[PDB]
Design a protein around this nucleic acid. Sequence first.
RNA 1: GAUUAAUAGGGACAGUUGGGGGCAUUAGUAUUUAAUAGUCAGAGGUGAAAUUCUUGGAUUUAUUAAGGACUAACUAAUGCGAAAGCAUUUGCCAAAGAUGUUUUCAUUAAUCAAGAACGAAAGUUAGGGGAUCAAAGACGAUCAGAUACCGUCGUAGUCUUAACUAUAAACUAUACCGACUCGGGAUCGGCUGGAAUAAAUGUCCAGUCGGCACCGUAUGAGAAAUCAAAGUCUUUGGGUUCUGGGGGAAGUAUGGUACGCAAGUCUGAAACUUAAAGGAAUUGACGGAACAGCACACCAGAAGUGGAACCUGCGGCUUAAUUUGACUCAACAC
RNA 2: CAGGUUGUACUUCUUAGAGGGACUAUUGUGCAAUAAGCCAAUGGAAGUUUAAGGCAAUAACAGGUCUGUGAUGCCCCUAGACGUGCUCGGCCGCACGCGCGUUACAAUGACUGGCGCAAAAAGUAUUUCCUGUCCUGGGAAGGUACGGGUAAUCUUAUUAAUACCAGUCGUGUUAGGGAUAGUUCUUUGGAAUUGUGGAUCUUGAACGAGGAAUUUCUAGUAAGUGCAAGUCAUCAGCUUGCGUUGAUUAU
Lengths: 98, 75
Amino acid sequence: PVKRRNAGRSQKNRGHTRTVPCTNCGRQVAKDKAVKRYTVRDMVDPSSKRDIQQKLAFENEKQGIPKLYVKLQYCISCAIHSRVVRVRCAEDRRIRRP
Amino acid sequence: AAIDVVNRCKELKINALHIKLRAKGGVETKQPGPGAQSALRALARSGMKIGRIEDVTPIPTDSTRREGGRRGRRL
RNA sequence: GAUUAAUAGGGACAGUUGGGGGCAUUAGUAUUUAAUAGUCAGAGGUGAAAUUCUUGGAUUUAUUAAGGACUAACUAAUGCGAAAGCAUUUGCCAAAGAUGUUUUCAUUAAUCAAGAACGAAAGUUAGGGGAUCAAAGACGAUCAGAUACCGUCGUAGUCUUAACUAUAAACUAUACCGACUCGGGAUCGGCUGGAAUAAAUGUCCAGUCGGCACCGUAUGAGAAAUCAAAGUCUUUGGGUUCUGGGGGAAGUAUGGUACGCAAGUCUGAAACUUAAAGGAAUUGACGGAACAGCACACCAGAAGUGGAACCUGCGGCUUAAUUUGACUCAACAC
RNA sequence: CAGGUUGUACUUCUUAGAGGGACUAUUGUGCAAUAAGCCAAUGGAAGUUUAAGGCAAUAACAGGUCUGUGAUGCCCCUAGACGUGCUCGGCCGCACGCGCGUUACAAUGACUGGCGCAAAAAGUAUUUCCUGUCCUGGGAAGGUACGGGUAAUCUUAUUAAUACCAGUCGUGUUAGGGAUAGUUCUUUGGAAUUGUGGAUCUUGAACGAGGAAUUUCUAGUAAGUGCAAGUCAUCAGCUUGCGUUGAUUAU
Ligand SMILES: [Mg+2]
Ligand SMILES: [Mg+2]
Ligand SMILES: [Mg+2]
Ligand SMILES: [Mg+2]
Ligand SMILES: [Mg+2]
Ligand SMILES: [Mg+2]
Ligand SMILES: [Mg+2]
Ligand SMILES: [Mg+2]
Ligand SMILES: [Mg+2]
Ligand SMILES: [Mg+2]
Ligand SMILES: [Mg+2]
Ligand SMILES: [Mg+2]
Ligand SMILES: [Mg+2]
Ligand SMILES: [Mg+2]
Ligand SMILES: [Mg+2]
Ligand SMILES: [Mg+2]
Ligand SMILES: [Mg+2]
Ligand SMILES: [Mg+2]
Ligand SMILES: [Mg+2]
Ligand SMILES: [Mg+2]
Ligand SMILES: [Mg+2]
Ligand SMILES: [Mg+2]
Ligand SMILES: [Mg+2]
Ligand SMILES: [Mg+2]
Ligand SMILES: [Mg+2]
Ligand SMILES: [Mg+2]
Ligand SMILES: [Mg+2]
Ligand SMILES: [Mg+2]
Ligand SMILES: [Mg+2]
Ligand SMILES: [Mg+2]
Ligand SMILES: [Zn+2]
């Protein structure tokens, strides 16, 4: 029978959508389908920043360390296994942004 | 490798360092490795002054058929 | 002496919208590879390593160049295209929807055997081009076995011109035209009123045509999953095209033999064989799947069988006979 | 310091009957929505629901027993019977393969001697059960000499062993260890020879802390150490209980 309405993807008008490589397996996945979560990563762990702030050098505009920018793109296959998105129950499958 | 450089640096008479951080951007995990936050940390602790900090992992505009193919590392 | 002008259809026209298309042009990093310098012993790759590369200098850092492909981030249930498909700039070439119309034309139309136009990939012929990845292949490793899932390389292709091939889970698996019927906001394009700023190819409020899509709900449909249509069908009939008739043998054949350079497409059997094959769900069991617990389960440690000689139970083999029960914890000093 | 008495004397010790006593109490963090509750400290004989057990739901395992049953269906046997009895064998037979265990490889020990520490169980119709005192044997064990009890009255408030002090041995498969075996003696039983058990003198093996594996086990618990009770005429290396000595690590 049928499991989803969007079958995991958002292709709603067009017949074909660009394919993209998986951040983790390298596998090819259609853009719309594949998981995404472009995150604002930080250069150093918590208590570890303070250590670099005191031994820091250049001016101090209070702008600290540049934060890392990671544009994340997972294919289902590994996205799951990678703790990202856990198999959700029946009616919770339609919930968006919990 | 970090502390080894700082020693060599006090001898070059240099105290401040600009950082250009990367990670085989090309068509590879544009994410910094592990020995990243580790290296910096070591330079700061062992004295060293730190100039500006950049991220220079070469992000491409297009791309070229990555590692593996179609399905990639499987297992 | 010539019906209206179809919330039918064809044209004219008007600003506008679009990653629709064809020629040009034009970038941008990146991958390779090369020059110019710069050092220094390791690089690279995996769970680990290994073939691989390297002081006739690797990996590495800066500048730059050649080259072939590719268009990131913005890029989303948003847009256009008959579909396949389509995202750097700019300039041409013919095209399209929708909206707007107190413009014409006035059945011109719906769908369709024949019969044609297209149709990612892969594949084919003859030339280009050849950067990356890579079928076959060559190697490392992994295994009891690996010419497999990882790793090192690599040819065809992948790019292109001109021919040919037409299939694909070519999917919404839901034919097109038409009329109806629930609620609701948010969208994309056009239009019309209005308000603030301001006088903006902007913003907002309110309408409304047309386009993806979603939310809620049905004394409507269903086998159910579910469906705003998969509804207005036993209260069984708007128009039209295509298709099916238990399963396997089979979409296969010394089949047909209309296409094709060639893979193969198109059409497409029978013999044979069978109670089922199927659909959707319910519970349960299992999962080299998510989440949450609990126990000397493991953790921290102890004592100690297992090795020794005896003892005692079980098997076995003997024997006239070695009574027999019991066999993973849930048999064996029971 | 032992012993004998005695008192309508006392109950701390002992017995056992009534009733107390904990419920998670008091105090502060975590929880926290209010909570249920969780933690730590204090008081406490006692805080892991105090500790250890008994009891043990619905289904089910075609688990096991018809050799426990005068509980039975069906099927078997029936007098040269699978009924019943008797005599003698066997279930313990040995090349081996498994599974509980017992003892040990020793100086944190063995052997000689000394030392009032325990608990729980049991026990008869006459002598037949527990057995105290006494006599005889080197000894196991005898005798019947004097006796109590059919039991908080008698074997007993003691007959444990580990432990503790002294002494010998002194790393030496030495004897630590005790298997195997040889006469003798003694008890149970008509009968022990295919050793019932026990005593004596010899004999004195493997074993030098045990591979791949693998079992229980958090407190008077593991371990060690002996004592009972079942079986039992006689036989424990089993079982079911009992107490003494008494810890590492967790929570
Ligand atoms: Mg498609
Ligand atoms: Mg264009
Ligand atoms: Mg490489
Ligand atoms: Mg270039
Ligand atoms: Mg758009
Ligand atoms: Mg762009
Ligand atoms: Mg054609
Ligand atoms: Mg060619
Ligand atoms: Mg091997
Ligand atoms: Mg390669
Ligand atoms: Mg307006
Ligand atoms: Mg509006
Ligand atoms: Mg139907
Ligand atoms: Mg709906
Ligand atoms: Mg009908
Ligand atoms: Mg054919
Ligand atoms: Mg099914
Ligand atoms: Mg036997
Ligand atoms: Mg209890
Ligand atoms: Mg029961
Ligand atoms: Mg019975
Ligand atoms: Mg007879
Ligand atoms: Mg006597
Ligand atoms: Mg006694
Ligand atoms: Mg001696
Ligand atoms: Mg004899
Ligand atoms: Mg003997
Ligand atoms: Mg014992
Ligand atoms: Mg006795
Ligand atoms: Mg006895
Ligand atoms: Zn993946």
